[PDB]
Homo-oligomer: A and B are copies of this chain.
C-alpha cells in the first residue's frame, strides 16, 4: 500500500501506489486549479532506468506551462506519441534515494543519495550513441516537462545517465534546488566550442537574481569571468554582487525594451541607439574600462535581444535558453554580421556538462540558492505564487519524502 507523504518504506521496498501532484487535460488552467493530488501506480523501471524516492523537489516555471497547457498540452503530446497515460506528473528537479534499478544499470545502486539532471534522451537510440551531442538527438527533451514521472510523485523515473551524487553538505531541499537551471547555465557558458568562458571574460547575465542567473553568475565567476548582472531592483543587485557579480545594472532605468525600430526608421533608430549606448556605458562604468561582454547569457528574448546583440563584443556570443518576454527576436545584421557575433540557442544539458556542474556543487564552490521551502500539499499554490511573481528570492523547493526541513546532510 501507499505510504504518507514525508515517509518511505524501508530502502528498496517499493509500494504499488504513490501520491503525486497531477495535471490532467480536463483541468488545464491556472496552477491552483490544474494541480490535484492523486494516487497512481508506481512505475516499474525498464532497462537503463532508475526509480528515485523523492525527498525534495524543485519548482520551475515549466510546471506553470504544463498546468496551463501552453504552448502545448504535454499529456496530449505524449498520447500522440503512443503513451497510455492520461495524467502528467511534472517536476524537473529532485534529490532523493534510489529505490530500484532496471537491467543494465551497473553504476547506480539502491540506497544511493542522488540528484537528477534534466537531460533526457533514449540511451539506446542510434543518434545518441553517435551524433554530435545527445541533446541534439530526436529523443532529447526535458525531464519532468516533456516526460512523465517527474519529481512531483513520491517516486520518479529517470535514466541512469541523469543520476548525479548528492552533495553531502546539502540538505534534501538545498540539493533539489539548482540542477535544472544550473546545468542549463553550465551548458550555455562552457558547452559551445569557440565561445566558452575564459579568465577575465566579461559575462552579461540577464535576470541575475533569478534561478538561472544566480547559477550563471557563480559559474562564470568560478571560471575566472567577470559577471555583470541585470536586475529589477537594488536588493536583487546586491544579492547578485554577493554571489560574485562585479556589479549590476537596474533595467528600470531604461525604456527602450521591446522589438527595435526597423533599420530604415532613422528617427526611431536614433532614440533606440542612445538608450542602448547608455546601457553599454554602465557596463564600462562597472568594469572601470571600455570592454564589452564576450558572452551574454540571454533568456528574456524578444525585449532584450536587441540590447544583447548591440552590447556583445566583436566575435562574442549571445547564448539564449528561453524567450520569457516573447520569441520574435530582432537581430540587427549591421552589428551581428559586421562585428561577427554569434547568437546561440541552448537547451538542457548533456551528461558531461551536468557532472561538471554538479562537481562545483559537490565541492562547495557553488551555492544552490535555496530561497523558500513549501509542503507537497502546496504545489498548486506555490506555482500560482510563482506565476503571480510572489515567491521569495531564491530557487523554491517542496518536501516530498523528507519528514521535516533540514534533513539529508551526510
- Residue numbers of A with Cβ under 8 A of B are 71, 131-133, 135-136, 192-194, 260, 262-264, 301-302, 305, 314-315, 320-323, 326-334, 336-347
Contact = CB atoms under 8 A, between A and B. Distances in A.
Nearest to A198: B132
Nearest to A263: B327
Copies of this protein in the assembly total 2
Contacts of A301: 333, 337
Contacts of A315: 131-133, 136
B333 A340 contact: no
5 contacts: A136-B314, A136-B340, A327-B332, A340-B347, A342-B344
A78 to B, nearest CB: 17
* Nearest 5 A/B pairs, CB to CB: A323-B333, A193-B194, A337-B345, A136-B315, A327-B333
A322 B305 CA distance: 20
A131 B262 CA distance: 32
A33 to B, nearest CB: 24
A329 B336 contact: yes
Nearest to A138: B314
A134 to B, nearest CB: 11
Contacts of A342: 342-345
B346 A340 contact: yes
A216 to B, nearest CB: 16
Contacts of A135: 340
A107 B331 CA distance: 42
Contact of A194 (B194, B321, B338, B346): B194
A343 B332 contact: no
A237 B247 CA distance: 55
A192 B321 CA distance: 21
A337 to B, nearest CB: 4
Contacts of A344: 340, 342-343
A129 to B, nearest CB: 15
Given A193-B193, A315-B132, A347 B343 contact: no
A331 B333 CA distance: 11
Contacts of A192: 194
Contacts of A345: 333, 336-342
A186 to B, nearest CB: 15
A227 to B, nearest CB: 21
A328 B336 CA distance: 10
Nearest to A332: B327
A320 B333 CA distance: 9
A367 B193 CA distance: 33
Contacts of A321: 337
